[PDB]
């Protein structure tokens, strides 16, 4: 009657060489996030050598009826916090076939903004601040002053923090809040496009951890959960809003 | 009081040398599968050295009442997910006595098709796609549009994926879809009769996963579901149907 | 809580040199087995060096009330698949005071039969098949035709099989059957009195695994189940009956 | 909760050098025991170096109101069941300050009896038989003919045996009886005052194991549970009564 | 639910060098205790290189509504029993901005008292005597004369002891009491301000252990529970009262 926990943790270096990999892309609605997996071969740490892939976009909800096929590309390579070992999560972005951004991409524009000379000569360290809430599934409300930096499912938050440490993303620090079940973590001085990458990946990791643990987070402005973006520069040195938009617009407007 | 999982997991290289082996043969209905186990002496990787063994055919149903004796042969030798250690599994095929195929064999015809000089020189690969739904025991209804890679019940599929990786199966990747609880995976470039072997072994492994967990899988097309074929060859390079037939009929017709 | 298995699964080489040893003898009805444990000093594989012991025969129910003293001899040197380590299980033979066999012994007669020059001349290897059923506490009925090699508490059976492999009993393979809950396993190569030894040890091990996992069994044919004998001789090379009677009558009559 | 067991099982030498030690003494009723803990600095096996300590005797009930102070001396150096590692237990005895034994001590008289030249030259060994019952917490009835060396909470007995084998109590075999829940165990060639020391230690370990598991023992003459003295000197070679009395009266009267 | 224990416990040296660190400060009410965390780069045992910090005083209840900033400093070097690894805890203290004491600071007074030339030459050791109670999470009453160490969740106390041993606290021994669920532990020789710091951090450790266990403690004078200090100086060498006050008032009055 065990929840298969004897499995799901097998060592792979003793049986085979193939390593699983999952492809995560932004969904059609702008906040939905969906993924499916494929095997791979001998591990490498260079995203350029990973093969491309596609999927059915109209089924997700970001591609037309006839042009469901929308290609994705590999650019970010990290570790896996739910199937340990050498398994890898890769943050792929949605594209209408032919190289042009999909209508709901908002990734190529950020790439060109942060690759523009006035920005790439600088170091747009965007320590964006993200905060959320952990309610439930059965009641969709938080468990149960002192709550700020306080005791409602702290194990979930500790698991998320340690999984983020393990994965390799740049996270800095967790913090509680007065409103029940509310926390926030800092990602520190990372590149704006990279900062959007880690924000999306960390939201996915949180969603998976909660669904494992028996709860669901609600990334909404009011469950208050929002976003604030700090800016660091070479000269200096909403809970569902797109991180690339806020990070890129600061780089575009300020520079 | 019910903790016996300390058993079922004992190391073998410290007490004895015997290694279990379970014989897997296709049942009478063509989709039902039966199996029983027997010891061995020493580890080996050559299927030709394994001894033969039989069973009572009329009890299973695919043999006559008086001719219940159904000789089986060893062809497949791969590890076991649910007993670990150094155990093996074999995908034996049903045969009438004297080397003649049983009425529900569908193994010798595909073997001779893929051993035909034209086909064997062709060396074709078949990434057969298989679709199914994991329903339940207590309700026998799917676990759970937006469901396409969107959630609950993923752990059974993760366990099955990792068990297939642990075994010798060549699997590719799970694709959650719109139908609740319904998932899917591709096999990949496997050589015909081999592709049928891995499809049957993977179906058995998933059946044991589900009966361990507490769910029941109905592979039938409409409990929709179907089967497709992939044809890659050196010249150019129903969800419950026999993999040998589809991979060989395209081998026979095209070649 | 209820976590006691940390103590149950301790190691002794880090603390002491004393090793437990459990003494098993045939009960009064001819099918019940009573036993307790006695400590020792150093491990050994020679049954002739073990100490002797005696119990209260009248309390058990196979000796006179006043002459309850029933000496027991050591026969078996095999490991314990419930406490592991260097723990051992030892056979015992009920005897009347003075070296004469107890009325319900049926062990010395088989010993002298298989020690006869004729029987030892034609080496009596005995493969014995034994059949049982899995009942339950609340119903005392099988868990839950097609059931032949199909699962009703397969974990109990896998545990028993692996424990038997660990504990030195020469078992050859389990075989699920048509009757719900009903299974059966073959013994294989075993020399007569030895065959009775492994049959009795395997029955005791199954009983203890059923009590550990919390489940009840009935080895009787109809709580139909039965047993057969095989005679592998050098010359040409009831589910609850005493193995010694069965394995020796064919040895005596044929040889 | 699934946690609290990793904490209880933390290794000691990884962080600090301090080792806990608990002080167990005979309570007011003569059968009850009381224990609280102190730290230490370095491991040692010589009882002559452990520091003295006292307590409040009026609260316990074996000291006068004004002279609640009751010094306790270090007696035994043996390990701990539930805090394994380098934790040790000491069997301290009650004493009115100034060297005068408490009326409920009954330990100094046995010391002087076994320290008398005739007895100490006799070297008397006492394999005392102790029998108890494992019923339950609340109902206080047995947990869960054939019962004599039988299936009523056997795990408790196995745990108690394996804990008693922690480099210490010279237990020499466990035993069951017809009375449900009833059990008993025997000690080896214990030297006089030791026999009482190990009997009290084993009773305390059994008490804590039962309270952890979920049962309560009831050491009463009629749960019938009693005791028997055994005498064996160099010349010749009640379930709740004080062991020191019985092991010394046979020492004093015979020698 | 069976998962998350593989989580919350991942190894860090395998993936990233970053180590989490949590900042605990005294709350506004005088007994509330709240904390947030942020990562670092490399381990160190020198409490002079860690970064600075601040938080929301008005939300917590310490600083005015407008000037809510409450600056904090690092001074403690310890470890975490709830996350293990190289994780550390620091006992920061509340200030008004600019280095001036906050109204509920009670740090500079004790620091100057113990660092006063006469006292620091004396360097008095304070074995504070702290006692508390473990009632319940839901009903806040114990789960259950003879109760004086003669149990109500002893596992919690054992866990707290071993956690305090791991965390580097100079603790010396535990004690029960007749009061239901009432315990206490001694810290023994500790240098002045370190006594108060260690009392506060041990209370925090116990608070998190009890909230993990599903049980709430009450640090109130009568659940009774108090605090008492010792004066073990080289010259002779309630449950919520501030340890610094009691340890420094005796330092100031006597010296």
Numbering used by the authors:
A (entry chain E), B (entry chain B), C (entry chain A), D (entry chain C), E (entry chain D): 1 to 144, 155 to 160, 166 to 238, 245 to 258, 335 to 352
What did the study's authors say about this model?
Decades of studies have established a striking notion that all three classes of GS enzymes, despite of dramatic differences in amino acid sequences and protein sizes, share quaternary geometry in dihedral symmetry assembled with two oligomeric rings. Considering that the active sites of GS are located at the clefts formed between two neighboring protomers within the same ring and distal to the ring-ring interface, each isolated GS subcomplex ring holds multiple integral catalytic sites.
Lowering the sample concentration, which favored pentamer dissociation, allowed us to obtain sufficient number of CsGSIbPen particles, which, in turn, enabled us to solve the cryo-EM structure of the inactive single-ringed GSII for the first time. The most striking difference between CsGSIbPen and CsGSIbDec is that several regions are missing in the electron density map of all three classifications of CsGSIbPen particles, with only 229–255 out of 356 residues electron densities in presence.
